[PDB]
Design a protein around this ligand. Sequence first.
Ligand SMILES: [Cu+2]
Ligand SMILES: [Cu+2]
Ligand SMILES: [Cu+2]
Ligand SMILES: [Cu+2]
Lengths: 79, 80
Amino acid sequence: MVQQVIRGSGVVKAIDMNSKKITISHEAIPAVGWPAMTMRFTFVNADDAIDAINALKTGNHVDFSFIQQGNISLLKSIN
Amino acid sequence: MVQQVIRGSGVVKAIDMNSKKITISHEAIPAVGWPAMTMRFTFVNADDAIDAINALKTGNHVDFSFIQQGNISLLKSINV
Ligand SMILES: [Cu+2]
Ligand SMILES: [Cu+2]
Ligand SMILES: [Cu+2]
Ligand SMILES: [Cu+2]
């Protein structure tokens, strides 16, 4: 019942420092019937952006958590 | 974006054939930050109520899938 905090991983493919949005090509999440795909997340703390740029440069898989409210995706944490 | 279909397992602890609900003490689902706890699922099909009553008698872990709409949890499958 408490709000879902979804663990994911993927490659960061885009970032927008204006709209405070990040594009991740995420892996499948079979626990909730979700396939691998690419989507945008608005990051819930705006200071989260910095680390993501590193990943964006490197092209490395990263772990992250996020919330899914209807059609919106809010990025909560990233490594 | 496609609708979440959440897989779980647990023990059926109650059923209500009027409100069409089943109470399952489900295991943790770490993928979505959810702990083990007890909650109710609304069912649609009578073969789901049947299987659930079996499980209710036996006390067996069962697998199940469900959708989460606001406060409702709607059962999609259940399997002894
Ligand atoms: Cu990959
Ligand atoms: Cu997605
Ligand atoms: Cu158990
Ligand atoms: Cu629950």
